[PDB]
Design an enzyme around this catalytic site. Structure first.
Site, PDB file in Angstrom:
ATOM      1  N   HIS A 278       0.857  -1.159   0.000  1.00 36.05           N
ATOM      2  CA  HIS A 278       0.000   0.000   0.000  1.00 36.05           C
ATOM      3  C   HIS A 278       0.901   1.219   0.000  1.00 36.05           C
ATOM      4  O   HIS A 278       1.745   1.374   0.883  1.00 36.05           O
ATOM      5  CB  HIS A 278      -0.898  -0.034   1.229  1.00 36.05           C
ATOM      6  CG  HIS A 278      -1.815  -1.210   1.237  1.00 36.05           C
ATOM      7  ND1 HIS A 278      -1.942  -2.058   2.321  1.00 36.05           N
ATOM      8  CD2 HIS A 278      -2.610  -1.717   0.263  1.00 36.05           C
ATOM      9  CE1 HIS A 278      -2.803  -3.015   2.023  1.00 36.05           C
ATOM     10  NE2 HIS A 278      -3.219  -2.834   0.779  1.00 36.05           N
TER      11      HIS A 278
ATOM     12  N   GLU B 242       1.373   3.700   3.123  1.00 32.39           N
ATOM     13  CA  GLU B 242       1.936   3.183   4.384  1.00 32.39           C
ATOM     14  C   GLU B 242       3.437   3.285   4.352  1.00 32.39           C
ATOM     15  O   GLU B 242       4.109   2.396   3.833  1.00 32.39           O
ATOM     16  CB  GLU B 242       1.523   1.737   4.614  1.00 32.39           C
ATOM     17  CG  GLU B 242       0.277   1.591   5.420  1.00 32.39           C
ATOM     18  CD  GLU B 242      -0.632   0.504   4.921  1.00 32.39           C
ATOM     19  OE1 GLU B 242      -0.224  -0.694   4.897  1.00 32.39           O
ATOM     20  OE2 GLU B 242      -1.778   0.860   4.571  1.00 32.39           O
TER      21      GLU B 242
ATOM     22  N   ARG C  42      -2.898   4.599  -1.580  1.00 31.92           N
ATOM     23  CA  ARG C  42      -3.059   3.184  -1.220  1.00 31.92           C
ATOM     24  C   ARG C  42      -2.860   2.255  -2.435  1.00 31.92           C
ATOM     25  O   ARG C  42      -1.964   1.400  -2.420  1.00 31.92           O
ATOM     26  CB  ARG C  42      -4.417   2.930  -0.540  1.00 31.92           C
ATOM     27  CG  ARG C  42      -4.746   1.448  -0.278  1.00 31.92           C
ATOM     28  CD  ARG C  42      -5.952   1.316   0.623  1.00 31.92           C
ATOM     29  NE  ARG C  42      -6.248  -0.071   0.994  1.00 31.92           N
ATOM     30  CZ  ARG C  42      -5.798  -0.683   2.091  1.00 31.92           C
ATOM     31  NH1 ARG C  42      -5.006  -0.063   2.963  1.00 31.92           N
ATOM     32  NH2 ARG C  42      -6.146  -1.931   2.318  1.00 31.92           N
TER      33      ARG C  42
ATOM     34  N   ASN D 164      -3.065  -6.027  -2.364  1.00 29.20           N
ATOM     35  CA  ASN D 164      -3.038  -7.057  -1.335  1.00 29.20           C
ATOM     36  C   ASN D 164      -4.249  -7.967  -1.305  1.00 29.20           C
ATOM     37  O   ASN D 164      -4.446  -8.679  -0.321  1.00 29.20           O
ATOM     38  CB  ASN D 164      -2.836  -6.442   0.043  1.00 29.20           C
ATOM     39  CG  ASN D 164      -2.140  -7.375   0.977  1.00 29.20           C
ATOM     40  OD1 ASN D 164      -1.299  -8.167   0.561  1.00 29.20           O
ATOM     41  ND2 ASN D 164      -2.471  -7.288   2.250  1.00 29.20           N
ATOM     42  N   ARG D 165      -5.069  -7.955  -2.352  1.00 31.96           N
ATOM     43  CA  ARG D 165      -6.155  -8.934  -2.407  1.00 31.96           C
ATOM     44  C   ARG D 165      -6.437  -9.635  -3.762  1.00 31.96           C
ATOM     45  O   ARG D 165      -7.533 -10.161  -3.997  1.00 31.96           O
ATOM     46  CB  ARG D 165      -7.428  -8.404  -1.727  1.00 31.96           C
ATOM     47  CG  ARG D 165      -7.856  -7.030  -2.108  1.00 31.96           C
ATOM     48  CD  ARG D 165      -9.302  -6.766  -1.626  1.00 31.96           C
ATOM     49  NE  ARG D 165     -10.259  -7.725  -2.214  1.00 31.96           N
ATOM     50  CZ  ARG D 165     -11.181  -7.431  -3.139  1.00 31.96           C
ATOM     51  NH1 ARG D 165     -11.314  -6.175  -3.599  1.00 31.96           N
ATOM     52  NH2 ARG D 165     -11.983  -8.401  -3.589  1.00 31.96           N
TER      53      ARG D 165
ATOM     54  N   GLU E  75       2.328  -5.625  10.882  1.00 32.78           N
ATOM     55  CA  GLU E  75       1.429  -4.489  10.911  1.00 32.78           C
ATOM     56  C   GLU E  75       1.776  -3.660  12.135  1.00 32.78           C
ATOM     57  O   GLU E  75       1.712  -4.164  13.247  1.00 32.78           O
ATOM     58  CB  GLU E  75      -0.004  -5.007  11.021  1.00 32.78           C
ATOM     59  CG  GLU E  75      -1.036  -3.916  11.018  1.00 32.78           C
ATOM     60  CD  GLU E  75      -1.700  -3.737   9.668  1.00 32.78           C
ATOM     61  OE1 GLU E  75      -1.905  -4.755   8.963  1.00 32.78           O
ATOM     62  OE2 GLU E  75      -2.035  -2.587   9.317  1.00 32.78           O
TER      63      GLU E  75
ATOM     64  N   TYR F 159     -10.754   1.157   6.011  1.00 32.63           N
ATOM     65  CA  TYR F 159     -12.010   0.426   6.077  1.00 32.63           C
ATOM     66  C   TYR F 159     -13.275   1.301   6.078  1.00 32.63           C
ATOM     67  O   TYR F 159     -14.389   0.797   6.263  1.00 32.63           O
ATOM     68  CB  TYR F 159     -11.986  -0.605   7.223  1.00 32.63           C
ATOM     69  CG  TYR F 159     -10.796  -1.575   7.147  1.00 32.63           C
ATOM     70  CD1 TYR F 159     -10.069  -1.753   5.943  1.00 32.63           C
ATOM     71  CD2 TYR F 159     -10.405  -2.330   8.263  1.00 32.63           C
ATOM     72  CE1 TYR F 159      -8.967  -2.634   5.858  1.00 32.63           C
ATOM     73  CE2 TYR F 159      -9.302  -3.225   8.186  1.00 32.63           C
ATOM     74  CZ  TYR F 159      -8.584  -3.368   6.982  1.00 32.63           C
ATOM     75  OH  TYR F 159      -7.498  -4.231   6.910  1.00 32.63           O
TER      76      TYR F 159
HETATM   77 ZN    ZN Z   1      -1.617  -2.145   4.378  1.00 30.48          ZN
END
Ligand code: ZN
Ligand code: ZN
Lengths: 302, 302
Positions: free
Chosen positions: B13, B16, B55, B62-63, B170, B280
Site C-alpha cells: 500500500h 503506508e 493506497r 493485497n487482495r 502491521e 475500512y
Molecule cells: Zn496495508
C-alpha cells in the site's frame, strides 16, 4: 457594525472529515449553529474531493482565492478547484467587497499534535483578537493556541479570506480519512464559543482591552533530502508530537535510520508547529518554526 | 540449513510509509537484514502507488493473488495492480510451487492503536506459531499481538501468500502518509527478531512446544448507516484507541452527533481490532470482532 452574515465551511480538503461531518449534520438540523438574532450558513466547499475522500482533485482549493485564479474566464477546461473557487467567491464574496460575508469559519484537521487551534491572518485586527481571547479563555483548561500567518510574502490565499473576518479552525492529531470523537468534540466546542462571542458582540457587550499569546510563523524547515530529493531523515522521536513546545539550538530535531541525531542550530529558541503533517510531505516541509509574541487588542463595541 | 529464500516486501500500500522507508534504506545498505548463511531480498511491491503516495492505483494489490487474477493472460487493459501481481508472482513465486520464496514479510501500517501486530494466515502452521512465539518473547515487555485470519469466508488473496510461510507485519497507530520514528523503531525490532529466529532455526537449534494467544476474526462491523447510506454515528470515545482490549455486551461502541450511545449487544465478550482503521471506511466497516484463543505448536528442528 453588527455582524449579519456568518458561514461555516467544511470539506475545504475532502479527507478532513470533522468539518465534513459537522457541516453535513448542520445542513440537516441547523439548530446548534443558530443564535437568537444571528443567521449562519453551513456549506461544503469541496464536494468532489469529499466524495473521493481525498485532499483535492486538481489542485489545493485552500491556496487559490487570489486574483490569479478568481479572475479568469470560466471554462469547463479549468482545474476543478479553480471552477469551484469562483463558484464560492460569487456565493460568499466577492472577496474585497462590502457585500462579501462578515465572518467565515473554515474547518480543518491536522495529523499534527496541535489540539484546538485558531489561525489569525491579520495581527492588527482588534475584532479577531477579542474573539480568539474569548474562545481560548472559554475553552480552558482545554489548551488552545493561536497560529499567526502574516507576513509579507508568505501569506496564503485561503478559502476563508473571502470574508471580511477570516477564521481558520484546526484540530489535531487526526489521521486523514478518520473521524475521531475527541476531535469532533473539541471542534464543536470551539465553534460553540466562536458563535457565542459574535452573539455577545451583537447584543451590545463591551470587551476591555485584552492580551493573547500568538505564535508567528517565521520559516518552514524541509526534511534533510537525498542527492535525489528523497527524505533522508525523519522527525526525531523527542520532537514528534511536541508542537507548540519550545525547541532550543541544542535540541534533537531529526533522526536518521543509521541512528544519528540532527540538532536545531541557529541563535534562539523556536516553537515548532505542524510537526509531521501528512499534507506537508508533498509541499517540502517537516514543520514550521514560530516565534512566541504577544498581541494586544483595544476595546470593542456593538 | 532448510530456509533459503527470504523477502521483505514494502509499500504494498503506497501510503503506508514505514515499509516503504525501511526497504528503500536496505536496498542501499542491506547489512541490517543479512544473517550469516542467509540471503534476504528487500523489495518495493507497488512503486506506482508509492510514487503517488496513494493506497492503490486501480485496485488493492493485497487482495488479488489468486487463481483468477494470477492466471489470466497478460494485457494492457488489465488494472495496474493485476499486471504487477503477475510480475511479483513470477519474481518471488510462482505461488504454491516448491521454488517460490520460503518466507515473505509484508510490512504494513494501520491508523488503529494496535502496536506490534503479526498476522497469521494458518492456525496449524507449526513453523509460524514458533516464529511468532519467538518474536513475542524477544519483544517483551513491549506487547506484540497475533491476528488470525482463517474462516471459511473472510480471506484474501495477499501479496505474501506467494510464500510457503507468509508473514504480515502491521504496526500502528500512524496516520497514512506520515512517517513516525517510534513506529519505525518497532517494525525494525520486529524484523530483527524474525530474522534471528530464522537464523537460529537454520543452525539446528531445537524449539520445544509453545503456546501463543491469537485473536480470530469472526465478523466485520460496519458503522450505522443513513437513509442514503452515510455513516450515522462514530466510534465511541471509550472504544477509540482500545484495540485488543475486551468489549462487553453493555459496553459503549458508537456515538451519534447528539450524542446517543449505541452499546455492543449480543451476549458474549469480543475483542475489537482495526478499530477506526482509515482503509475500512471505503470498505464499509468500523472494526473487526475477534475471539481470543490459545494456539499450540509442536516442537520444530533442523
Ligand atoms: Zn496495508
Ligand atoms: Zn485542511
Amino acid at each position: 457594525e453588527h455582524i449579519q452574515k456568518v458561514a461555516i465551511f467544511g470539506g475545504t480538503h475532502g479527507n478532513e472529515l470533522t468539518g465534513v461531518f459537522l457541516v453535513k449534520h448542520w445542513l440537516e438540523n441547523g439548530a446548534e449553529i443558530q443564535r437568537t438574532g444571528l443567521e449562519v450558513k453551513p456549506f461544503i466547499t469541496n464536494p468532489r474531493a469529499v466524495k473521493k475522500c481525498t485532499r483535492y482533485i486538481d489542485c489545493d482549493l485552500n491556496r487559490i482565492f487570489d486574483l490569479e485564479n478568481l479572475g479568469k474566464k470560466m471554462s469547463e477546461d479549468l482545474p476543478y478547484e479553480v471552477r469551484r473557487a469562483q463558484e464560492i467567491n460569487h456565493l460568499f464574496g466577492p472577496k474585497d467587497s462590502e457585500d462579501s460575508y462578515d465572518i467565515i469559519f473554515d474547518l480543518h484537521n491536522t495529523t499534527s499534535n496541535m489540539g484546538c487551534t485558531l489561525i489569525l491572518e491579520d495581527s492588527r485586527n482588534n475584532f479577531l483578537i477579542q474573539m480568539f481571547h474569548y474562545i481560548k479563555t472559554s475553552l480552558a483548561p482545554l489548551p488552545c493556541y493561536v497560529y499567526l500567518i502574516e507576513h509579507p510574502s508568505l501569506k496564503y490565499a485561503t478559502t476563508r479570506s473571502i470574508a471580511k473576518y477570516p477564521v481558520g479552525i484546526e484540530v489535531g492529531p487526526q489521521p486523514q480519512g478518520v473521524l475521531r470523537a475527541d476531535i469532533l468534540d473539541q471542534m464543536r466546542k470551539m465553534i460553540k464559543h466562536a458563535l457565542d462571542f459574535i452573539h455577545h458582540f451583537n447584543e451590545g457587550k463591551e470587551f476591555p482591552p485584552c492580551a493573547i499569546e500568538v505564535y508567528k510563523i517565521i520559516e518552514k524547515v524541509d526534511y534533510p533530502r537525498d542527492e535525489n530529493g528523497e527524505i533522508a531523515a525523519i522527525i526525531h522521536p523527542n520532537l514528534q508530537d511536541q508542537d507548540w513546545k519550545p525547541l532550543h539550538p541544542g535540541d534533537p530535531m531529526f533522526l536518521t535510520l543509521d541512528g544519528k541525531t540532527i540538532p536545531l542550530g541557529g541563535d534562539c529558541t523556536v516553537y515548532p508547529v505542524f510537526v509531521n503533517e501528512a499534507a506537508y510531505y508533498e509541499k517540502k516541509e517537516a514543520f514550521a518554526k514560530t516565534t512566541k509574541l504577544t498581541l494586544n487588542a483595544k476595546s470593542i463595541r456593538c
